[PDB]
Design a protein around this ligand. Structure first.
Ligand SMILES: Nc1nc2c(ncn2[C@@H]2O[C@H](COP(=O)(O)OP(=O)(O)OP(=O)(O)O)[C@@H](O)[C@H]2O)c(=O)[nH]1
Ligand SMILES: [Mg+2]
Ligand SMILES: [Mg+2]
Lengths: 86, 74, 271, 81, 506, 56, 116
RNA sequence: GGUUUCUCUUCAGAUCGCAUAAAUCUUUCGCCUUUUACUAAAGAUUUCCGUGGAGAGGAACAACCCCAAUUUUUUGAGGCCUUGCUUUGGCAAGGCUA
């Protein structure tokens, strides 16, 4: 009925954990009926997700940029970023 | 709907293909299915240790078809 | 307040058929080839006359070495049609010359004789194709027995809709219809603004008329041309409103009368 | 019809990198990727998750076994959605 | 009296197999400019005019997605169709790779279409055909769909016979079946090939494969529904060919319903065809209506993009068959190879065969395709004219590059750089050159040659003498004659000893 | 708003005034005269509303 | 040798006669006249001296009410009828000459124009 | 929350209003005794007959059932160990299962 489940925070930054576990934080490019997701200006986290980590906060971080993933490897989503003004 | 596997380009040729579970073989791709399950003749399997088992023609598990690559040039 | 009409095509087709005798029976522009505006503008600017066209006063009013007649090759005499068709090649001192040219593709529309034959229907006047050529070709035609079949829902995209109805030949005939009759909506005009005979005098080669009416034809073309030329834009604006200022006063009343009664009133008051 | 599948279809002619279900990363100029993401491409350079290398003049990539697809930044500039 | 997009354009530019350069040719009025324009709109919603005839050709570059969504770069030389101006056709041809004939349905083949076909065969280009204005069979001729098919097939087989006249090996004959042919009507937004029609069919209906479908339509194939299988004749039923029953009949009925029944039955026919139209758009006159209905139904132009993708060589393949005929060395040791590469590299070779003048002043713009290399503004370049032979460097002036432009029809896109494979408008190499010229790097040597100056289809035999009224004014007249020589490819000028400045035209 | 009168109001007014020679009116005289300046407008409005031969 | 022009006139069934008359006045030699199958129009092909083709199209369109419309292109040279070297031809200065002597006239005029 | 109609207020013709009038002025031309009334070309400006733009008030009338063996809600990828590398954690391999 509402149908905005993705396009509401679409264009926003969000961290999505994959069914493998990588926490990809990027600007949402589109949602999908299958969970076909795209993220622009993309980072991925493997070692830790920083929430005020004094020793380290940005590590085990891979640059993806344009990161296009399907729905099979979709695990969970959370809001992490405000949309870039570009 | 009912898309066809685009393997006529790899068709009539030989390829080295990994199927799931560490499985690796090489054989002449002679066909496929709409589920991508391909019967490719001259299957010679090279186990992870190096064992060489030429079994003849067999089908390739489509659900478990990990990745095939052509053994020659286009 | 009677602006903005909207009609259906049965209406418009009947209207067309009733107005059929006041109208022009041509479908394209190739008739007015050297008889259109830019042709008459160029003719005027060069002070030369077209056989059936108007004449005007000349727009404005020494030795030469080209003109030596011993050097000329005269095969066919250069006429005013040529000098007007190609005003930059057959003309010295062309000032304010508009460039006529048109080859507008010949529109070939055949009217339906009787309402019986189908809308789409081959005709005698159309030339019979009877196409013949060399060994036609062959192709990557997919012979069956490989396999193929239409997933049996699909049909020709429209099937119960027939090829035509009792509105088709008319709907098409209104596609080439002079100005008012090829619309379906528009604004309402004043009765003074509708020149019902304009397209009679805009026509070309009348061939067998008393000199009286030939001269009248070309005087009317001259008027029409000058009108087209002298169009100064509305250029300015104010809208003072007279009968409203009158009716908003205690001294004028209002009513409804018969046109003849108002006419007799007006003659008595002028007297 | 998928917007990501559409971006992938566009990805032909540009560089494409594929992380597989096993975790290998392959890079090459993408030729033709179907709706089912079966990426039949050429000149793939694939590094395995342990550090081993491999390369092929051609390659095929099954769809349901794709882990990720990263393209060159040519795309970052369809925004109407 | 395109900030976000030019970047992406440049991406396809550098790509060098996402692009195709084509020449639109055909007879007088047969639709080229209206096609090009309606298409310019389909991308950007953002003397020739007064005569109503196209005299000089126009370059247009656009990005169009094809039937798969892949965006492409398109370079279009839209050329006059008047027999007298084929010189601009030959310019666009030498700088282009393949050629779209436009042929009018209700006309077919005529003089310039025939001659241009002969010309593109003897210039070794690819030949793809758009049969245009097919509505003039429906709305104007009113031919029963069968006989419309007859005349269509006749046009196609005759253009075939003509290519047989001039190309010895029939690698390619023409049939819609291959992606060789669009059917169109540029005015109403109708442009489709069997591929595109079958694609809409399936994409709305069930899950049929469109390619097998596409391959069944043209050519005397029937369809008995009980079989659900397409078979050369075995209805003695007297049934229509599949082409009729599956493309001509529904399109015929679309028109018939629109021009006929706009008030009565058209809303339900739009129901069926899945096209929703607002009330205001139901309140249109019939020709705007027609184009709206057909454009909502038919999508943009996909038949064109498919034809051009499938049968155009694409400069990367491109250059090698080209530089043989073009170049005077052709392919030997240095430059034939360097070019046939097509790589952005080294030699920086270019061939400019057009001078598009700047309406204001004396300066012009040279225009041509860069074959090898990559050119940036402010570079110094060395031009060679047709007189320049290997050991004739006098003809080799040198200058810089003022600015670079890409052309929307009458829009300038100034730019920083251009790679090989692309057309370009150069500002500042104008003055040293006459009709045809070719360009290499400035003062850096490899060595240069020239592609053969243009051969023309026509011989200019009409002779016109010119002389100013006040003999005082001879130098200004001579500057005028230079300028017109720069603008016109085949114009010949001479000075007859007896005092005449003489112009030779067609 | 301004509401319209019955036709006999004006018909009677004009019939009464007849031709302004009776002394009863004799101030209308000068207003009657002043309305001359607008008489070419009344004629134009009359003639452009002519009744069109398919009507009675 | 003079050039010849290849003229192709698409025109209705009516004005074929007028095309004939105009070509006869301009030294025509009509080659062929055939219908355009699929439309009620005829195609006429003819040859015509380039000297005579001046205004030919305009006169055609004029006489046929814009029904006719013809294009023309250089096709092949042909031997002008006359003897180019004959002092026994005397060319009146302004009027067009009959067939036997167009060659004398053209060569004289071209030499008096440039070659002297 | 809609159209239509009336009244009131304000803003604009760049090809228009798919129609086309008159006056004034400037320069030529023609009529001819003089001035008005006129001629026919170019040019400029005005007036008139209609139209478009924006808003306010009022008015009237409508109306509050079945499915998942390649891409996500059936997926049988299950376990253990030996070796190694690691500061331990942890991580790489093979083997055995039932
Ligand atoms: N019947 C019909 N007429 C069309 C169609 N498209 C264009 N036309 C008309 O055909 C005429 C041709 O005009 P252009 O589009 O400029 O044709 P063109 O070939 O580019 O003109 P040139 O370049 O000078 O040869 C136009 O006036 C259009 O009105 C069409 O689809 N159907
Ligand atoms: Mg054109
Ligand atoms: Mg006096």
């Amino acid at each position: 009925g509402k149908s905005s489940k993705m396009l509401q925070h679409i264009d926003y930054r969000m961290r999505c954990i994959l069914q493998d576990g990588r926490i990809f934080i990027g600007t949402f490019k589109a949602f999908d009926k299958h969970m076909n997701l795209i993220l622009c200006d993309c980072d991925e986290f493997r070692k830790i997700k920083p929430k005020n980590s004094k020793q380290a906060e940005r590590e085990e971080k891979r640059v993806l940029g344009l990161v296009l993933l399907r729905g099979e490897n979709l695990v969970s989503m959370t809001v992490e970023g405000p949309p870039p003004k570009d | 709907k009912a898309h066809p596997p685009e393997l006529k380009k790899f068709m009539d040729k030989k390829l080295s293909l990994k199927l799931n579970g560490g499985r690796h073989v090489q054989g002449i791709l002679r066909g496929f299915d709409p589920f991508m399950n391909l019967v490719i003749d001259e299957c010679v399997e090279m186990a992870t240790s190096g064992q060489q088992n030429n079994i003849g023609m067999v089908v390739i598990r489509g659900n478990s078809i990990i990745m095939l690559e052509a053994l020659e040039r286009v | 307040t009677y602006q903005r009409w909207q009609f259906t095509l049965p209406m418009m087709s009947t209207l067309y058929r009733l107005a059929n005798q006041l109208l022009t029976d041509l479908v394209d522009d190739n008739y007015f080839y050297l008889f259109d505006l830019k042709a008459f503008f160029t003719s005027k600017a060069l002070n030369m006359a077209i056989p059936g066209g108007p004449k005007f006063e000349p727009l404005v009013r020494d030795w030469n070495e080209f003109n030596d007649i011993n050097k000329i090759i005269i095969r066919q005499p250069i006429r005013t049609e040529y000098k007007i068709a190609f005003p930059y090649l057959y003309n010295n001192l062309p000032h304010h010359v508009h460039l006529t040219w048109y080859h507008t593709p010949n529109v070939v529309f055949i009217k339906t004789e009787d309402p019986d034959l189908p809308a789409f229907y081959f005709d005698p006047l159309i030339n019979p194709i009877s196409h013949r050529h060399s060994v036609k070709s062959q192709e990557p035609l997919p012979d069956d027995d490989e396999e193929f079949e239409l997933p049996e829902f699909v049909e020709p995209f429209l099937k119960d809709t027939p090829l035509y109805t009792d509105n088709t030949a008319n709907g098409i005939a209104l596609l080439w219809a002079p100005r008012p009759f090829n619309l379906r909506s528009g604004r309402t005009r004043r009765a003074l603004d509708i020149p019902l005979v304009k397209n009679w005098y805009r026509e070309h080669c009348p061939a067998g008329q008393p000199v009286k009416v030939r001269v009248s034809y070309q005087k009317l073309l001259k008027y029409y041309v000058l009108n087209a030329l002298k169009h100064r834009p509305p250029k300015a604006q104010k809208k003072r409103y007279l009968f409203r200022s009158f009716k908003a006063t205690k001294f004028f009343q209002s009513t409804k009368l018969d046109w003849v009664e108002v006419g007799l009133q007006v003659c008595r008051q002028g007297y | 019809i998928g917007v990501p599948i559409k971006v992938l279809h566009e990805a032909e002619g540009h560089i494409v990198t594929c992380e597989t279900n096993t975790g290998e990363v392959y890079r090459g100029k993408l030729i033709e990727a179907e709706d089912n993401m079966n990426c039949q491409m050429s000149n793939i350079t694939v590094t395995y998750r342990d550090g081993r290398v491999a390369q092929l003049e051609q390659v095929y990539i099954r769809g349901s076994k794709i882990r990720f697809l990263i393209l060159p930044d040519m795309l970052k500039n369809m925004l109407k959605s | 009296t395109t900030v976000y997009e030019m970047d992406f354009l440049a991406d396809l530019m550098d790509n060098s197999e996402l692009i195709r350069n084509v020449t639109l040719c055909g007879h007088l009025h047969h639709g080229k400019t209206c096609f090009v324009d309606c298409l310019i709109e389909q991308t950007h919603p953002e003397t020739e005019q007064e005569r109503g005839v196209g005299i000089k050709s126009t370059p247009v570059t656009v990005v169009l997605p094809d039937t798969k969504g892949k965006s492409y770069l398109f370079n279009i030389m839209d050329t006059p169709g008047h027999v007298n101006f084929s010189d601009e056709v030959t310019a666009g041809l030498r700088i282009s790779d393949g050629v779209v004939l436009f042929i009018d349905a209700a006309e077919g083949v005529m003089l310039n279409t025939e001659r241009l076909i002969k010309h593109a065969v003897q210039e070794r280009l690819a030949v793809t055909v758009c049969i245009n204005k097919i509505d003039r069979l429906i709305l104007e001729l009113k031919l029963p769909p069968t006989d419309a098919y007859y005349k269509l097939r006749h046009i196609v087989d005759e253009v075939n016979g003509l290519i047989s006249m001039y190309s010895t090996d029939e690698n390619l004959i023409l049939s819609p079946l291959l992606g060789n042919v669009c059917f169109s009507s540029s005015q109403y937004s109708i442009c489709f090939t069997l591929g595109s029609f079958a694609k809409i069919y399936a994409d709305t209906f069930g899950d049929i494969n469109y390619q097998e479908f596409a391959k069944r339509l043209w050519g005397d194939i029937y369809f008995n529904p009980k079989t659900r299988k397409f078979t050369k004749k075995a209805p003695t039923s007297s049934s229509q060919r599949s082409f009729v029953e599956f493309i001509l009949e529904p399109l015929y009925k679309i028109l018939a319903q629109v021009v006929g029944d706009v008030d009565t039955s058209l809303p339900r026919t739009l129901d069926e065809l899945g096209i929703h139209l607002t009330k205001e758009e139901l309140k249109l006159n019939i020709r705007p209506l027609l184009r709206l209905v057909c454009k909502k139904f038919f999508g943009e132009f996909t038949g064109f993009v498919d034809m051009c993708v499938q049968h155009i060589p694409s400069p990367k393949v491109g250059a090698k068959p080209k530089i043989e005929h073009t170049y005077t060395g052709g392919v030997d040791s240095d430059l034939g190879e360097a070019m046939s590469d097509c790589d952005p590299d080294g030699p920086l070779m270019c061939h400019t065969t057009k001078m598009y003048s700047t309406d204001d002043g004396v300066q012009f713009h040279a225009f041509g395709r860069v074959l090898s290399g990559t050119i940036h503004a402010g570079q110094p370049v060395k031009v060679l004219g047709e007189n320049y032979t290997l050991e004739d460097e006098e003809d080799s002036q040198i200058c810089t590059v003022g600015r670079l432009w890409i052309s929307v029809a009458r829009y300038h896109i100034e730019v920083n750089r251009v790679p090989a494979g692309n057309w370009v408008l150069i500002e500042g190499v104008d003055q040293p050159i006459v009709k045809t010229a070719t360009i290499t790097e400035p003062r850096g040597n490899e060595e240069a040659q020239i592609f053969r100056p243009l051969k023309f289809n026509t011989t200019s035999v009409i002779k016109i003498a010119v002389e100013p009224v006040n003999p005082s004014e001879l130098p200004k007249m001579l500057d005028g004659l230079r300028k017109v020589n720069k603008s016109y490819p085949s114009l010949t000028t001479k000075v007859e000893e007896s005092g005449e400045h003489v112009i030779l035209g067609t | 708003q301004k509401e319209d009168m019955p036709p006999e109001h004006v018909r009677k007014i004009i019939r009464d005034h007849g031709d302004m020679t009776n002394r009863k009116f004799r101030h209308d005289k000068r207003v009657y005269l002043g309305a001359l300046k607008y008489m070419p407008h009344a004629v134009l409005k009359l003639l452009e509303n002519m009744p069109m031969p398919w009507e009675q | 040798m003079e050039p010849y022009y290849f003229v192709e006139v698409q025109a209705p069934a009516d004005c074929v006669s007028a095309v004939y008359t105009v070509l006869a006045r301009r030294r025509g030699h009509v080659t062929q006249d055939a219908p355009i199958p699929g439309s009620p129009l005829y195609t006429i092909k003819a040859f015509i001296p380039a000297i005579d083709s001046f205004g030919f199209e305009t006169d055609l369109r004029t006489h046929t009410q814009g029904q006719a419309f013809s294009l023309s292109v250089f096709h092949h040279w042909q031997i002008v009828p006359g003897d180019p070297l004959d002092k026994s031809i005397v060319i009146r200065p302004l009027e067009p000459q009959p067939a036997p002597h167009l060659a004398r006239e053209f060569m004289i005029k071209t030499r008096r124009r440039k070659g002297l």
